[PDB]
Amino acid sequence: SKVVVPAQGKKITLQNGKLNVPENPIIPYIEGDGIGVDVTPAMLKVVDAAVEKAYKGERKISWMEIYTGEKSTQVYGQDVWLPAETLDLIREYRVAIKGPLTTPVGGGIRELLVALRQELDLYICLRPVRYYQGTPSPVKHPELTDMVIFRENSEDIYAGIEWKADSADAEKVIKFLREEMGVKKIRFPDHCGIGIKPCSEEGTKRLVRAAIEYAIANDRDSVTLVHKGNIMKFTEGAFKDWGYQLAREEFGGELIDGGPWLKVKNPNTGKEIVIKDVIADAFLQQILLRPAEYDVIACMNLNGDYISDALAAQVGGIGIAPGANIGDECALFEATHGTAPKYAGQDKVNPGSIILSAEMMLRHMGWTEAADLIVKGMEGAINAKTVTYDFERLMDGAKLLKCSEFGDAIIENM
Amino acid sequence: SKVVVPAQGKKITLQNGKLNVPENPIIPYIEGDGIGVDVTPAMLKVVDAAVEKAYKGERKISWMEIYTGEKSTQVYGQDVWLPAETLDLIREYRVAIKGPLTTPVGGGIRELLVALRQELDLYICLRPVRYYQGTPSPVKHPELTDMVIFRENSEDIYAGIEWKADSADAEKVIKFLREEMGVKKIRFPDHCGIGIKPCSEEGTKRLVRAAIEYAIANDRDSVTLVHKGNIMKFTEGAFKDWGYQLAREEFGGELIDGGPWLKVKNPNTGKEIVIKDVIADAFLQQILLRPAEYDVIACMNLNGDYISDALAAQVGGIGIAPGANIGDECALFEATHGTAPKYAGQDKVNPGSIILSAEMMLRHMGWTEAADLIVKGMEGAINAKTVTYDFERLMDGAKLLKCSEFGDAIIENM
Ligand SMILES: [Mg+2]
Ligand SMILES: [Mg+2]
After folding, report:
1. Matching InterPro entries, A to Z (chains A, B)?
2. C-alpha A19: how far from its chain's center?
3. Of A85, A194, A293, B41, which sees the most CB atoms within 10 A?
4. Which residue in B158, B169, B235 is closest to A162 by CB distance?
């Protein structure tokens, strides 16, 4: 309604599982709030330059601005933070990319990003974290990290099923729990908020199936189910058991003698993928002390939220970390950082995260050459120490660049 | 009944909040399973040596072996993993110390440690993590870490209120949620496990009150409430708000202009303690990138479980990390690592964690001099590079010591 759908440009089609990408596809983008005003122009410019370089003018993207968050209230009216047509348009045009979003407090509006994820059933939150040589890191050996996080995105305590302390509703489910379910384990039943954590069989098998499949397709060495199953037996513990069960039943998993670990043979390279599990708090130590043991990681919503963030900080990538939200009908790639409003409009923040989510987008479209040119550009700029303020603070011998100038530096190292 | 209560030795008394410790107190200890057989003898010997040194023979501890876990089935019978008298004896004798415990799988027996914590209402899990100079660390600057974790121990998803997928009970609470509570947010209501996360006002105020009080008594610079309140508004978000509310109402907190942060003035040193909050996934990055900003940490059960573990791994202390479980009537100090059965009986693992939980025990008894002699001994042994295998693997120029020999090395550096 306020989106101006591009004159040239053609819709991507989903021809039974497979994406059918034209040479001039229309790609929706949500600019983002705060520093989205800085990083999204830098990403449109380097993506455009990378497909110009790779396909020598044969392919072109027709970018289409759609709206969510704060810019949405400025376009449609004060009350509309998530327009219904943004949801239809992501679904229709199949892939989209976004900058950081603001959700308001004081209005009873739950996280707009989690609303997108659940409303479009984008059940895979894919977070790849690897070290880019030369980025300043807090740990001694960040180069030992090359993991890919498959975080379940549609259930867990993130579903948002909760009630306020002293509210009538909370009173009522605490009454049901104590009287009809006989729970004697609530220490203080009065002035008590209640949260519901659900974990289903379809929810975890569709996420784990995607993780094992990614390991076969990219012949990764292992898939680690991380969970806190010793304490949460029927949600987290069920996740781990449904994950091992699916590796056995669908991928022909075999005991690595005695168990619990399984072996899956890659149907293409002939190698064996270890399917293993580790408890979540011990995993938080293991990624620091033994990061070379792990590769593809499958976990639930909250655990994936924490694992992702801790892992991005150890390779020095809190501001260059990419992210994808993938469902069966569409996908939404994104800047994984926040809006940082203090710096907005100053052209100073790292455009790295949304640019690396744009290469994930391209790679997903099958435009691998363009995707490869962007990570070449990225490795070059960082190695040339021609970098933005967040990196330059920690580097000795670096040249300080603006957000936009680092965009040009990526195009220059392509 | 099978505990032989010591002939010499007198019970510690609780004279209205205050502990009344005799010169010869009876202290219960649970040896532990696995490597408990190695580390608990090393701790009894260095504690004994430290109080012998500090009080020149005037004070003596009368150790009393009590039973839980696997050794309990060997003493009382196959069916008894947690004897009822262990609970009465910890409560009666007021302080106790324990090694690592095994909980069995296949019997429907929930974690024995969480049973101790909840059954005795030991609502504070106190975890201090600081760097001991010379321990091998994965990060560049571990010496910047000196934090004290106040983890709420009696509620959260750890309460153990959950139901199995496809069980009649799960069917029933999913029916109540959908029909009587009208929840439309469960993606897959079939084959769905359910967990209940409770968070009450009394539960978080009693934990936060203990954290702020510890900051005043040890004049620590700040108290950080960590939570994932943007997603879990009525449990995690309520925790943060009840924490700020208690700092205002009981400690005379004032806005550090504009807020949300508060200032508490230490009634003794005159300094100002910053009361702040940070979101839990961003905190996991912040402890790596800016560890000097944080000091005392107050958080809920699961978050404290993760924070504790990640923090112990960055200062190279996964095997020397101390821990206390403190309630109003008693306390239970502990080895925070597992049973490691492969190495049990070999005299090779680090006795560091249970020995440093024994100095926390002593310090809590008011036997500060003895406590101080143990951390002096610890700093000496580690600095002398006269160390056990887990440290020696990562050190160049170290002498390898057995579990028991490192005990003697601590006594020697006292
Ligand atoms: Mg996150
Ligand atoms: Mg732990």
Report:
1. IsoCit/isopropylmalate_DH_CS (IPR019818), Isocitrate_DH_NADP_dimer_prok (IPR004439), IsoPropMal-DH-like_dom (IPR024084)
2. 20
3. A194
4. B235
Cβ-proximal residues to B122 (8 Å cutoff; 6+ apart), any chain:
B116, B153, B154, B325, B326, B327, B330, B331, B332
**Nearest-5° angle of CA B93, CA B94, CA B100?**
95
SS3 call for A89: helix
> Does residue B281 have an active-site annotation?
yes
Chain breaks in chain A (C to N over 2.5 A) after: none
Helix (H, G, I), strand (E, B) or coil at B280: helix
Choose among A149, A95, A153: nearest CA to A126. Answer: A149
Identity of the residue numbered B83: P
Bridging pattern class, strands B95-98 and B331-335: parallel
> Closest Cα partner for B213 from B257, B186, B247, B183?
B247
| Cβ <8 Å between A186 and B159 | yes
Q: Which two tokens stand for residue B85?
A: 């008298």
Kindly report the number of other CB atoms within 10 A of residue A34's CB atom. Answer: 23
- Please list every residue in chain A whose beta carbon sits closer than 8 Å to the beta carbon of residue B159: 185-187
Could you report how far apart the first and last alpha carbons of chain B are, in Å?
Answer: 38
Number of domains in chain A: 1
Rounded distance between C-alpha atoms, residue B92 and residue B62, angstroms: 15
Cα–Cα distance list, B96 to A140, B19, B116, B366 (Å) = 39, 14, 12, 15
The residue written with tokens 């790679």 in the block is: A363
The CATH number of whichever domain residue B284 belongs to comes to: 3.40.718.10
Enter the tokens of residue B340. 């490691």
| Nearest-angstrom CA–CA distance, A274 and A220 | 9
Q: Is B165 in contact with A289 (Cβ distance < 8 A)? A: no
Q: How was this structure determined?
A: X-ray
Catalytic residue among B71, B197, B228, B240: B228
Instruction: Report how far ligand 1's centroid is from the alpha carbon of B280 (Å).
Output: 9
Cα separation, A351 vs A407, in Å, equals 7
Q: Collapsing DSSP states into helix, strand and coil, what is residue A259? A: coil
Kindly report the nearest CA distance between residue A314 and chain B, in angstroms: 7
Q: Which two tokens stand for residue A397?
A: 């011998």
What are phi and psi for residue B332, nearest 5 degrees? -135, 110
Structure token pair of residue B276: 């702040």
Give the distance from CA B303 to its chain's centroid: 13
- Residue A198 contacts residue A155 (beta carbons within 8 Å): yes
Domain span at residue B68 reads 1-414
